Amino acid sequence: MSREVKRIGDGLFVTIEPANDVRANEAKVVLAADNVWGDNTGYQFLLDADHNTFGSVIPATGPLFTGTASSDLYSANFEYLIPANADPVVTTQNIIVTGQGEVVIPGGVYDYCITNPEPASGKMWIAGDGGNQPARYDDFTFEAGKKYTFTMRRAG
């Protein structure tokens, strides 16, 4: 259900700071990664402002999809994305491999998941839950005036 090597997968480590560079009704989300799996595989952050995708478009367990996806899997369901041109393709380069990408979003309620495309296995995996925050989430509140940094690392 999760990508793992030697029973060691990956995970999400969240940091929140005051955001002082956005509007009063805005939050900032950052996705940071540093070649976590050593193979130039990366990550995408998917945000649904309608928070109605958990359990249907975002599966409660297992990868987001395998193999081929409908070309509108993101454009129909997720309003905000990191990177901004993130697309539902396992082979895409529209991923955060090293460094970070960001998105400024309304304060509000969201469903989200973080993906880790792996061409070698044909899976658009959702990242593991071995960090301090689940990598998929139903009705998370991103509060205005705050900056959420989601840092990806290897985890149990």
Author numbering: 360 to 440, 441A, 442 to 515
Question: Which sentences did the original study use to describe this structure?
Answer:
Porphyromonas gingivalis is a major pathogenic oral bacterium that is responsible for periodontal disease. P. gingivalis exerts its pathogenic effects through mechanisms such as immune evasion and tissue destruction, primarily by secreting various factors, including cysteine proteases such as gingipain K (Kgp), gingipain R (RgpA and RgpB) and PrtH (UniProtKB ID P46071). Although its detailed function has not been elucidated, PrtH contains 989 amino-acid residues and multiple domains, including a cleaved adhesion domain, small Ig-like fold domains and a DUF2436 domain. Although the structure and function of the catalytic domain and some K domains of gingipains are known, the structure and function of DUF2436 have not been characterized.
